[PDB]
Design a protein around this nucleic acid. Structure first.
Ligand SMILES: [Mg+2]
Length: 81
RNA sequence: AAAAAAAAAAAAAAAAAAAAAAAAAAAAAAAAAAAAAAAAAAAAAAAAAAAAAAAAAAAAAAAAAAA
């Protein structure tokens, strides 16, 4: 009940996701720059966990999630630059 | 008066019993009767009778990270 892993709430196909593209899609793509700020990492993970909380209160996040999953696999889940 | 040594080396010696035609009995139904080395000489291991062997146990992984 305490591991609370935002990679696991949005996991797909045993592909342990790289949260750079997750923050580029689900929020502003400010986590696509660089410099590897850990405080930025935890803060964006906080924001994505809040996004999980909001759209799990909406409880329909798998629909648009799988739509943008297929859409980003047309992108092949790469880094948009 | 058939009157013989009275036992080495743990010697050595007894049996502890039969066709019965006694009386007017034919010619193997036995179940098989069945010997040869020795010129430096004969030589299975696995565990040993298939009187009934269906014999691919699904797979799919689009991929990571971890800024
Ligand atoms: Mg990652």
């Amino acid at each position: 009940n305490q591991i609370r892993d935002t990679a696991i709430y949005f996991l797909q196909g045993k592909r342990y996701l790289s949260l750079r593209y997750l923050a580029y899609v689900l929020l502003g793509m400010n986590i696509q720059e660089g410099n590897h700020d850990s405080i930025e990492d935890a803060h964006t993970a906080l924001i994505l966990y809040k996004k999980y909380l909001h759209l799990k209160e909406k409880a329909i996040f798998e629909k648009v999630l799988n739509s943008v999953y297929e859409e980003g696999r047309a992108h092949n889940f790469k880094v948009p630059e």
